[PDB]
Amino acid sequence: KKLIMGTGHLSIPTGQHVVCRPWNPEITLPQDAEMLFRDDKFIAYRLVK
Amino acid sequence: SSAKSQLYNLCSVRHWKAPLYEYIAEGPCHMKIFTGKVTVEMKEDSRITVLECFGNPQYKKKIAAEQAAEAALWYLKNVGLE
């Protein structure tokens, strides 16, 4: 869960399939969605297959 | 400077394919909202990760594509890129 950020970066889930939408608290992710990370303006995720 | 152009600059500077923009269109014919989708092919040490970014629905494709780009930038900054 929460994680204040300094000058770190995040890893790319190399070779998979990454998706980013605007995040809204009543969004619905698809079945295969695996949330990578989000602030309160966007969200990133990937698919299972 | 527009987010659409910043994403183009970032993409060449890293020797990446130029980003591709598509559009989902919803509604009856007298009110179409557009959702921007931008695809970036992230090449890191000779391997490829595909980045697909959407924005919110806008009434103008141009605003909708801008916001998609802006999402891609958000993600690329968060993984330490420019």
Residue numbers in the entry:
A (entry chain D): 306 to 354
B (entry chain A): 83 to 164
What do the authors say?
In vascular plants, dsRNA Binding Proteins (dsRBPs), DRB7.2 and DRB4, inhibit Dicer-like-protein 3 (DCL3) to stall endogenous inverted-repeat dsRNA (endo-IR dsRNA) mediated gene silencing. Intriguingly, the crucial step of endo-IR dsRNA precursor sequestration is the high affinity complex formation of interacting domains of DRB7.2 (DRB7.2M) and DRB4 (DRB4D3). Next, we establish that DRB7.2 simultaneously interacts with DRB4 and endo-IR dsRNA precursors, where DRB4 contributes towards enhancement in the affinity of the complex with dsRNA, thereby impairing DCL3 mediated cleavage of endo-IR dsRNA precursors. Structural and biochemical studies presented reveal that DRB7.2 harbors two independent surfaces for simultaneous association with DRB4 and dsRNA.
To determine the interaction interface in the complex, we crystallized DRB7.2M:DRB4D3. The data collection and refinement statistics of the complex at 2.9 Å resolution are given in [Table tbl3]. The cell content analysis showed the presence of two protomers, a heterodimer of the DRB7.2M:DRB4D3, in the asymmetric unit. The complex is primarily stabilized by the β3 of DRB7.2M and β1 of DRB4D3 by burying ∼ 20% (1750 Å^2^) of the total accessible surface area (8500 Å^2^) of DRB4D3, signifying strong interaction between DRB7.2M and DRB4D3 ([Fig fig4]). The crystal structure of DRB7.2M:DRB4D3 reveals that V132, E134, and, F136 of the β3 strands of DRB7.2M, and V323 and C325 of the β1 strand of DRB4D3 stabilize the dimerization interface through hydrogen bonding as well as polar contact formed by T131 (DRB7.2M) with G320 (DRB4D3) ([Fig fig4]). Further analysis reveals that the complex is stabilized by an intermolecular salt bridge formed between H322 (DRB4D3) and E134 (DRB7.2M) and a cation-*π* interaction by R326 (DRB4D3) and F136 (DRB7.2M) ([Fig fig4]). The association is also established by the C-terminus of the α2-helix of DRB7.2M with DRB4D3 through a weak *π* - *π* interactions formed by W156 of DRB7.2 with F342 and F347 of DRB4D3 ([Fig fig4]) and hydrophobic interaction between V161 (DRB7.2M) and I317 (DRB4D3) ([Fig fig4]). The structure of the complex indicates that the DRB7.2 dsRBD primarily utilizes the β-sheet region to form an interaction interface with DRB4D3 in which the y-shaped α-helical face is completely excluded. The location of the dsRNA binding site lies on the opposite side of the DRB7.2M:DRB4D3 interface thus giving accessibility of dsRNA to DRB7.2M independent of DRB7.2M’s interaction with DRB4D3.
